[PDB]
Amino acid sequence: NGPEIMSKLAGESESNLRKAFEEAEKNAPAIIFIDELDAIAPKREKTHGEVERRIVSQLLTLMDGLKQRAHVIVMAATNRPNSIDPALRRFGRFDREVDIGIPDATGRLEILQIHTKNMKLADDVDLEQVANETHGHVGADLAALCSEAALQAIRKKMDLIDLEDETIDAEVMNSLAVTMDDFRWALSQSNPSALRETVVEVPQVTWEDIGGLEDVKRELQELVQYPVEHPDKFLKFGMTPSKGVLFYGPPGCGKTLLAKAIANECQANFISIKGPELLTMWFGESEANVREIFDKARQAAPCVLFFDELDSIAKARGDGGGAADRVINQILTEMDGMSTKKNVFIIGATNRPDIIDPAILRPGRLDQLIYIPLPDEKSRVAILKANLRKSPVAKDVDLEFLAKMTNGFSGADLTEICQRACKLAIRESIESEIVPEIRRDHFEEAMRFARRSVSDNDIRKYEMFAQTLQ
Amino acid sequence: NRPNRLIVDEAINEDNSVVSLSQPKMDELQLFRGDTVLLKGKKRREAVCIVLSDDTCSDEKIRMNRVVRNNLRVRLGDVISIQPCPDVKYGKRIHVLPIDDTVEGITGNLFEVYLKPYFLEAYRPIRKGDIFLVRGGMRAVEFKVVETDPSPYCIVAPDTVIHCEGEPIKREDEEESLNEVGYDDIGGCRKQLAQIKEMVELPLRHPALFKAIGVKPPRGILLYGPPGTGKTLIARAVANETGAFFFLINGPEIMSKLAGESESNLRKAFEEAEKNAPAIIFIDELDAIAPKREKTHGEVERRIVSQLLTLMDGLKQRAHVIVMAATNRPNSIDPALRRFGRFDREVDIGIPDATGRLEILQIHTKNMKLADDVDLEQVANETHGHVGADLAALCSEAALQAIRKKMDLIDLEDETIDAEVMNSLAVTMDDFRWALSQSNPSALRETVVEVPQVTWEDIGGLEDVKRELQELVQYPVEHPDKFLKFGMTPSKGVLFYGPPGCGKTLLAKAIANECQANFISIKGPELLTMWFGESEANVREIFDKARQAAPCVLFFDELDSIAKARGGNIGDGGGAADRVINQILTEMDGMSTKKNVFIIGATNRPDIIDPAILRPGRLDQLIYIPLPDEKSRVAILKANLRKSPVAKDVDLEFLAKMTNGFSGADLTEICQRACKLAIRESIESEIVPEIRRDHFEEAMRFARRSVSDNDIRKYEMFAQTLQ
Ligand SMILES: Nc1ncnc2c1ncn2[C@@H]1O[C@H](COP(=O)(O)OP(=O)(O)O)[C@@H](O)[C@H]1O
Ligand SMILES: Nc1ncnc2c1ncn2[C@@H]1O[C@H](COP(=O)(O)OP(=O)(O)O)[C@@H](O)[C@H]1O
Ligand SMILES: Nc1ncnc2c1ncn2[C@@H]1O[C@H](COP(=O)(O)OP(=O)(O)O)[C@@H](O)[C@H]1O
Structure with missing residues (x-):
């Protein structure tokens, strides 16, 4: 446990781990798991202290000691990649990485089936509805959800009525019921969802909602499906694929609905950075997130990065300036060094094609342009x-x-x-x-x-x- | 299952001799209005109260205050057994003696001060064992019915002789001091109590229920709110209500102690507290020690944090103990305790409001004789940003005012406090008036999540808008079914616009009282204040204190406040998307669609608004309020x-x-x-x-x-x- 090794008297922390990886290698093959690595991993400047550093070293070493012929695997979980310290990114220690995105549409629903697989649920119990309203919930959040839910159907039935004693009865439990109205309480009860920061889910909409300009539908697939389901034939000719497309035209024509709909036609992730979040970066001149975003689009493939109100930045400012903008330009960077031979399509739509930095349309980035007129x-x-x-x-x-x-x-x-x-x-x-x-x-x-x-x-x-x- | 054994609930009637029941309940047990009753509870003990009718009481309940509670040795929940007993002929003798720990200081005729005004032809039917409490003389005196001629139980008539050997009595063990804390001492917390109450109803009342069940005993509880809101008070009350042990910890209390020992202090803390489990380990001022946020410049500072962080994940020890932590704010603490195993549950303790405050005072003036001119209401009607603490000393100074004048100058008080004197003392409204004008260092006046004290009786203009507004708020709140019967979704909010003087807010206010929901009001100035400081971060801090108290109506007086500022009409080369304005769209986009929060905003300048607010999905509804x-x-x-x-x-x-x-x-x-x-x-x-x-x-x-x-x-x- 994170603070578990920090609580212990200083110096002993090195022995704690010392015996840790020690007693854990005895039973090897083993799996030394460490919850809250960052709790001791900021070899960063956040060490205005002496032991704070000494602890870090102890691990940093024991890790390069995993080449001991015992075949043990060290697992470290954390809040984010920035909390830790690159000192552990040494290609010998924590060389492999895997993101654990938050639960989505099909996920959540399925999750519940794992914690309600013991309590009799009445027919009116619409388990689906649940995962259909918990927008930014995690496997943990949904957890106690059942906890409180069952306790609701509990405080009523045997509580007011029943026996418990020397101990409870078997019969009783099995008869207990938990209708949907119970959970309804749970939801309205505790809503402190862990997070609602960002989303890397998959579109729950096919072309059954578009019903407009079918022509565009397939042509779009000519840059996304054909070049991914036929890289053998595309390379047959030699040329290199097109990175991404840019939609433009009058608002209220579901352009986003396309880039998103197609994201299903290709069952990939759909990352959506709406204009406002862009501006938010602008007013704070911290487009650094830009690099933090085109990455979470990569740590999740396939995927379609979509920027609404692409001009949202320019829309604000034009003035005595020119086209290029702080954020807008920075985006070109993370798009230039974006793996050409990777699996990521970059789409962007704008109700203002007249105020876009031409650098985005330059062949190599968004060389493909499509107009989706009115209905x-x-x-x-x-x-x-x-x-x-x-x-x-x-x-x-x-x-x-x-x-x-x-x-x-x-x-x-x-x-x-x-x-x-x-x-x-x-x-x-x-x-x-x-x-x-x-x-x-x-x-x-x-x-x-x-x-x-x-x-x-x-x-x-x-x-x-x-x-x-x- | 026998229409006798009932559950003990709160007490709508504060009388040391009554057990208010529902009308349709009495009929079940054939009880009249003045039918005296025989109460039989645990610890092989009884009592003799009086049954009444209460329309606001479910048949499956028997209301009774703590007095009737303690004497029955039955906490709130346990089973009792009412019983008609119309044979308790009036009593002859009564021997009642005060308790040594409830009279220290007063002296004199106790038979005239407390007992006389109590048995004032009230016919209160006492009994051997009961422990009635009488308030007067700015204090509480607990008496014990030692022995009565018509034992055990005999009604007290204006004839019954009363004795007072004038000799105190050592408080027993099974007998808790009614001077302790409880719910009958908490004001302005309807939505509040509910929260905590049911969260510990099982893990603290039926430790056996979890002995056999795969349910998670919610162990962590957090209490937000501005110091003074009486956080600690609650905690203690909960324990003294269920009877669970209570171990208190002070913020700096564990920091003062020599380093290292702080880990042992807690070490023995959770240790000695788990012995008496079920228990309730409460920690006053958590942020004093858990600021693992950033202010972690020392090992000792960090080492302490860890100790707890662990002991918490040690609450899965099968002892069923509840750890309560209260603090200033959610930002002071450190997310390390938000682990879904430690302090997973949270509850805000908003500052007292209209009905709250008023009620609060009734809790601290319930011992001092208040003259008729005393307009207790007026008080809570002028203390805008006051807390349960602020209003506290308010009485303190108030009484002391009526004090420094009467017995002070009339010098009956150099030696001791005669009983008679106190009971005669009076405290008019003019006294408190002083108190208010005296110390106004009220706690907070920072923000507010109160409920509108204005109906449509003050609007009186454009009635048409009144109902139509309800077409977006009333229907979705109490008519979601018919609403979802088409699959469409309501409107997040409206955007009032028109010429000043209209009364835009009068709507946002009314409609709120209509739904008796909270009314959050961020006037233009506070917006600009965020603008000139480019710290709209509060924006995220605000749309949150609206979800932490739902239903609720978020209002932004003079939305254009940021418009006319940066230029307004022609302004600069900029466009509508302003730093704050835009950020607001964010916290409105990720604002729970299927939640319970209506977003209203009014502007005397509809010509300078960022169109992104009117875009369907946010403020797709627009209404014009024309002159009178x-x-x-x-x-x-x-x-x-x-x-x-x-x-x-x-x-x-x-x-x-x-x-x-x-x-x-x-x-x-x-x-x-x-x-x-x-x-x-x-x-x-x-x-x-x-x-x-x-x-x-x-x-x-x-x-x-x-x-x-x-x-x-x-x-x-x-x-x-x-x-
Ligand atoms: N072709 C269409 N068929 C059905 N609905 C549409 C169509 N085009 C737009 N809509 C609807 O119009 C609204 C436009 O939505 P939106 O996706 O935000 O626009 P855009 O993608 O052009 O920015 C949505 O509610 C969407 O369901
Ligand atoms: N709601 C309330 N009802 C009755 N008394 C209150 C209330 N709030 C505060 N008080 C009074 O003020 C004191 C505040 O106590 P405390 O729990 O320490 O507050 P906090 O911890 O939030 O600073 C209480 O002891 C009580 O006498
Ligand atoms: N329709 C109305 N009926 C009675 N008084 C009104 C009305 N509208 C405004 N007033 C009065 O005008 C003043 C401005 O009130 P208010 O409604 O709060 O401002 P605003 O127009 O900004 O919403 C108040 O003193 C209020 O009593």
Whole structure:
């Protein structure tokens, strides 16, 4: 244990380890695990003390002593790669590394099945729903979750009613039940989720939600799938693949939904650095994270790095400056030294193709550019059928009709009018009660507050660019 | 399972002789209103209280204060057995004697001070063994019914003779001092107690339940809050409530001791504390020793930390002990204790609020005779950033004020404290008035997570907006089903905009009281303060103290506060994404979508807002609050002059047509002006204070239209497209 070896009197810490790796090598093959390495690993400047350093050395050595013919494996876990000290990155000590990303969609759900595999769960127990609302949870967080959950179904049944004594009864337990309403409490109970810092999950959306511009769908695969599922044929010709693409056009057209959707079509990770986080780096002139990010994109392959509001930086500033920006430029660096022959696609979308540093489009980085215009009359229909899939859409509901009504709108605006049909549908519900089928009068009474996010003037601006940009 | 054995809960009735039960419960056990009852509990002992009706009490309960509790030797939870006993004929003799450890200092007629006012034709049915407590003379005196003629139990009538051999009695063991701590001494912690209570209900009440079960006995508990919020108080109360041992540790207490020994101090600490387990090891001021954060410039400093860090992961020893740590803030400590095995659970202890404070005082003035003029309410109505501690000495100084005057000057007090004197002592409101004006070094005034004390009775303008607002807040809160019946998601929040004087906040306030949720208010200035210091890091520290207290409404008065600052309209070459403004989008993006928090923001400048806030997903809902209509102007005053001396001749409908371009603010302006002229009349004559017409009219003289006609249109120009 981290502090376990720090608590002990100084000097003895060296003997503690001394006997540690000693008594552990006797039973070798063994696996010396150390929880909280950084608790004694900052050989960094964070040693304003003497013993603090001496302890570090002791290990630093015992490690290069693992070449003793006993075949033992030393495992060290920690918070982050920055906490430790490069002194252990010696290609003889802790040469191998593995990240333990936080639980995701399929992960969490599965996790619970591991801690509820002993308590009788009623049919109403919707285990799925759980992992469907815990956004930044870890295997630990979800742990006590059950803990409190069961204790809830407990303090009620045998507690108020039962016997316990000299000891509990077998029968009782097996009969005990824990409905969904119990866990509901647990969630609303303790929400101090360990973290909600960054995400390296995999997209839970296929092309079944896109339903627009199918052409782009495959062509995109021409830079990502074909060059990864056919590196033999691609190299047959000789040329080298294209690193990444850059989407551009009017907002509210799910461009992100593409780069993300495709991320599933290729079952890879989807890293998303939205514009705000970029600016946050800008206002703090600490784009150093940039190097910290293109790395977590690498320590997780396959993967698709996506930067929304790519111009978000330039958008802020243009002025007496030129194109290149502190963050923007730094990104080019971690993209230049980005392993060419690796497995990582770099996508970026911007509602402002007019204010991008040309260095990104320069062949070798984002030499591929694609325009995803507004929702064609065609796509408009499915767009609705796709944004109204899991919806109490009545039979009289006729979308083809609307497919000709909203022309300047976008996948976003279309969604706008949608939710509006509901914030009026539910209103009928709650009102009269004190009939859940969305009807026409709603949708129509909804277009009343219709808005065209994309003005006609702009409709042309992106085109002015579109041509020369292509 | 026998409608007799019930569970002992709190006590809605603070009487040393009662066991409030539910109405439908009495009917089950055939008990009248004044049917005296026979209580039978553990430790082979009984008592004789009185049963009552309580609509706010589940049939599966029997309310009773600590007195009725202790005498029954039954903590909160255990099983008792009520019983009708209409044969307890009035008693003849009663021998009650005070306790030596509850009278040190007072002297005199105890039969007239405490017993007389107690058995004042109250017919309180006592018994052999009971230990009733009577408050008076600024203190607590515990008595013991040694022997009574009609033993064991005999009702006390205005005839029953009472004896007082005037001789104390050594407190027994099984008998805890009612002077100890408990829940009946905690104010403003509804959401609070709940938290801790059920967390120890099993690991501290049924140590046997975990003897056979694979459940994790929550061992770590942390308490945030500003010093003075009475953190420690709670801890102790919990123990003395379940009966678990209590081992206390002081922050510097373990640092003072010679180095190295600090490890043994704790070594023996958790050691001697586990012997009496189930126990509750509490540590006052954790951050004093656990700042493994950064201030770790010494070995000893570090070595101490480790010792605990380990003993904590040693709580998996099958002894079922609970370690409680309280501190100033979550940043002071060190994440090393956030290990999901040590201090995995956390609970904030917000500062006292409206209902809290008031209630608190009732806990420290429950011994001193307060005159009728004493307006206890007024107190908690002016102490804005006070804590349970601050309000404490408040009484202290207050009483001492009524003290230095009466017996002090009238010198009956050079020798000792006669009983009679104390009980007669009085402490009017004017006394406390001094206290307030005396020491105002209140603890905090930094931030606030209170609940609005204003309904829609003060708004009186644009009713339409009132309900529509509820269409985004009321429905999702209490109607998630119908809501999810379509799969769509609610709106994170609205963005109020319009001309000053409207009353934007009056909405954010009302709607909050409507949902009786918390109302967090970050006015523009505090925003700028973050801007001029480029430390919007607090932003992350704020959207968090809203989730640590849900439901809750986050409000940002004058969102544009950062706009007009950096330039506003033309400003510089920059665009809307401002350092703070943008950072806010972050803590709003990762803000739990499926959580319980509504984000509202109002701005008298809708023309200079970063469009990223209106983007669907954050503040996709926008509402315009226009000036006072022919109507508003009316109700607005009728309301803005509610608790005021408005004469009968006062005719507002008249003014309802006079001020047209004005706003709820301006209207208020002319109002106060009517008074700063009304009070002016008062004084003069003195050397008949009721608002009248000549005032109001003599007030419109200095009438001002905050909203010019040019602007009146500007917001509309926007209104059209913005909506
Ligand atoms: N072609 C489409 N079909 C269905 N929905 C769409 C389509 N395009 C956009 N949407 C919807 O419009 C909104 C636009 O979302 P977003 O992904 O943020 O835009 P973008 O990716 O262009 O930046 C989303 O709610 C999305 O579901
Ligand atoms: N909520 C409260 N109810 C009753 N008394 C309180 C309350 N809060 C504080 N007090 C009074 O103030 C004191 C504060 O005690 P303490 O637990 O040491 O606070 P903290 O540890 O937060 O500084 C208590 O002993 C009590 O007399
Ligand atoms: N609709 C209203 N009805 C009655 N008084 C109002 C109204 N609107 C504003 N006022 C008064 O105007 C002043 C400004 O109030 P407030 O609503 O808090 O400001 P804001 O317009 O910034 O939200 C207050 O003294 C308040 O009592």
